Amino acid sequence: QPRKKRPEDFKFGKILGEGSFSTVVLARELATSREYAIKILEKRHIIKENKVPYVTRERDVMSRLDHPFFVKLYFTFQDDEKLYFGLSYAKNGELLKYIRKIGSFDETCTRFYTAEIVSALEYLHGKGIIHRDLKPENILLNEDMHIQITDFGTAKVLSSFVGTAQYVSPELLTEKSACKSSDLWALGCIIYQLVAGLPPFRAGNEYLIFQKIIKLEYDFPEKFFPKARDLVEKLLVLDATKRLGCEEMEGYGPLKAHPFFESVTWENLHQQTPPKL
Ligand SMILES: Nc1n[nH]c2ccccc12
Description:
alpha+beta; Transferase(Phosphotransferase), domain 1; five-stranded antiparallel sheet; two-stranded antiparallel sheet; 9 helices; 9 strands; globular; membrane; nucleotide-binding; serine/threonine-protein kinase
C-alpha cells in the first residue's frame, strides 16, 4: 500500500450529499486527475453523539464489498478534526432523481433496474450483510447508468435503529428486529415506486405511515404491470418468513426465477447496456 493520502492531495469541489454526521464532497486527486467522492466525518461530532460504532461498521462493511453494483471504498485518511473516506463517484446521481424526472419507469427499465437491485442484494446477503435503509436515494447511478448502492452507515453484519419511514418493514415496527427480509420488503416498495411513481405507503406523517405498513394498507394503480404486481405482492408480505427471496423461501433462486424477470440474463447484468430513460 502507498503512503497514506491527505487533504492536500486533492482539489475539493462541490458538495454531493449532506447528512447529520457526514458531508460528501466531490474531489479531484491531483497526481492522477481521478474524481473521488470523499465522505467527510467530524470526529468530535461522532464521539459526542455515540456514533463511533456506526462509523466503524460503515468502514468495515465497505471493506468487504467487491462488486460493481456497490460504492467502492478506495482509501481512508484523517487529520486532527476529520475522517475521510475515498468513495466511488456516481456521476449521474440518485435513482430518485430519474423517477421524478420521467415520472415512472416502463416495463423494460423497471425490469432491468430491479434485476440489478436483486442481483446486488443477492451479493450483499451472501456476505451476511443487511443494508437496513435501502431506498432510491441510496441507489446511485454511475456514468454508464448502472446502479451503485451506497450509505452503509446503518448496515448490520449478521452474527436498534429505524430506517426511512416509507421503506420500514412491519417487523421493525413490531419487534425492533431486522433481517435479510427487511431489505426484500424495501425492494417491494422500490419496485412499486418504479412502476407507479410513488412509494406504496404514503400519509400525512410518520405515525400514519407506520399504521398503514403494519395494516398492509396500500393498493395498485389500474395500469400496474401484472407480472410486476404479482412480484410485489410476494415481497410486501407481513410475515417476513414468506417473502420471496428470504431463506425460508429458499433464497434468490425462486426470486430470480419469477416470471417478471423472464427475459433477464442474470450472469452479466453489469456488462449489458441499460435501456434508455
Ligand atoms: N455522487 C456520489 N458518488 N458517490 C457518492 C457517495 C455518497 C454520496 C454521493 C455520492
